[PDB]
């Protein structure tokens, strides 16, 4: 979750296969309100 110059340039949209995977990692943070969690 870092950025130097731009983000759109090196985005994870072009590679759907990558998004489908990352979605699982991001989903963890995207959810988990009441239940246990870090956020």
Swiss-Prot record:
Its biological purpose: Plays a role in the control of body fluid homeostasis by regulating vasopressin release. Activates GABAergic interneurons which are inhibitory neurons of the nervous system and thereby suppresses presynaptic glutamatergic neurons. Also stimulates feeding behavior in an orexin-dependent manner in the hypothalamus. Functions as a positive regulator for the activation of orexin neurons resulting in elevated gastric acid secretion and gastric emptying.
Shown chain mapped onto the complete sequence: 310 to 347 of 615
Recorded superkingdom: Eukaryota
Name of this chain's protein: Neuroendocrine regulatory peptide-2
Location of Pyrrolidone carboxylic acid modifications: 2
Protein source organism: Homo sapiens
